[PDB]
Every structure is written in C-alpha cells, then in structure tokens.
Amino acid sequence: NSFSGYLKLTDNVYIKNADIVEEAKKVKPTVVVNAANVYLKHGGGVAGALNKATNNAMQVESDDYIATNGPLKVGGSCVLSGHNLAKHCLHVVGPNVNKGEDIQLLKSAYENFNQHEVLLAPLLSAGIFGADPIHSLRVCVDTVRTNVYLAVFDKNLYDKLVSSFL
Numbered sequence: 350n351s352f353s354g355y356l357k358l359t360d361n362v363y364i365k366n367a368d369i370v371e372e373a374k375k376v377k378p379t380v381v382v383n384a385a386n387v388y389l390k391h392g393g394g395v396a397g398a399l400n401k402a403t404n405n406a407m408q409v410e411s412d413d414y415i416a417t418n419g420p421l422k423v424g425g426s427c428v429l430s431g432h433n434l435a436k437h438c439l440h441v442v443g444p445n446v447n448k449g450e451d452i453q454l455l456k457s458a459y460e461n462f463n464q465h466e467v468l469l470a471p472l473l474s475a476g477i478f479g480a481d482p483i484h485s486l487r488v489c490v491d492t493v494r495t496n497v498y499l500a501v502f503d504k505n506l507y508d509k510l511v512s513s514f515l
C-alpha cells in the first residue's frame with residue numbers, strides 16, 4: 350500500500366492522475382477496485398485494462414463466479430482474486446445512468462468500499478456509465494469512510510476534479 354504522489358482531498362480521500370493498472374503494479378495494494386458490470390464481463394474502460402493486465406485470468410475467474418453465484422445487482426459487489434495487481438479485486442457495479450439505472454445507486458455502489466480499510470480505486474459510473482465524474486467524486490467523498498486512493502487516467506478530467514474540489 351506504498352501510494353506516492355497523491356493529493357489529499359479529505360481526511361480519507363486521496364487523488365492522483367495515474368493509470369490504475371500501473372498504480373496496482375507499483376503499490377500491489379491489498380484491494381484494487383474494478384468498475385464492473387453485473388455479469389463481470391470486462392470489455393473496456395478500467396475493467397478491460399485490469400483484465401488485460403492479468404492476461405485474461407480475471408475474466409476466467411469472473412466467469413466461474415457468475416456460473417456459481419449468478420450476476421451481481423446494480424450497487425453491489427463481490428471480492429475475487431487481485432491476481433498480479435493486488436491481494437484482492439473488489440468488483441463494484443455503479444449504475445449505468447445512460448441505460449436508465451438510478452443515480453441513487455451510486456451511493457450504494459460506494460458503500461461497498463467501507464468493508465475494506467485501504468483501497469486503490471477508480472471513480473464509479475464515469476465513462477460509458479454516463480454519470481458526471483465530478484458528481485461521482487462528491488458521492489465518494491460523502492459515502493466512503495475508509496481510506497481510498499483514487500486514480501484518474503485523463504489529465505483533463507483530473508484537473509477538473511481537483512479544481513472543483515479544492
């Protein structure tokens with residue numbers, strides 16, 4: 350959990366303009382959060398990048414979880430192996446507001462982070478899920494009470510987040 354170059358936003362939320370895959374390889378955190386979908390099909394965005402960094406080991410494992418347990422619900426999570434990126438991967442489903450999923454479930458999605466003392470994570474429901482990433486940061490800040498180190502890939506997005514927060 351050797352995080353470096355993070356800007357402290359609140360007592361428990363830190364942010365960095367970084368590739369979450371590279372942060373996971375450097376830090377080897379106890380928990381890396383995946384911005385997952387209900388079937389754990391890691392086809393793009395952070396999910397695609399984390400799965401690609403495990404050479405598809407995350408996807409094989411996720412398919413077996415789904416065969417045995419069925420899909421997650423929107424706002425829910427499951428803990429699986431972190432493979433070579435972390436001890437554990439907490440897969441969390443935020444709402445896809447572009448598919449009419451309720452934004453109220455973004456709070457429920459972030460509540461899953463509270464079962465873990467320290468996490469390396471992306472912002473939830475950003476990108477293709479369609480939520481406003483600055484709103485997603487506000488929900489994170491209001492909801493997460495454990496220590497969360499957020500990695501943001503896009504410098505343009507990172508600068509907008511840091512400008513709006515501090």
Ligand SMILES: O=C(O)C1=C(c2ccc3cnccc3c2)CCC1
Nearest residue numbers: 394395398471472475476501502503
């Ligand atoms: O910074 C992020 O968490 C976001 C995105 C993203 C996309 C593609 C990535 C590819 N490799 C690593 C991280 C990536 C993150 C898209 C929406 C917000």
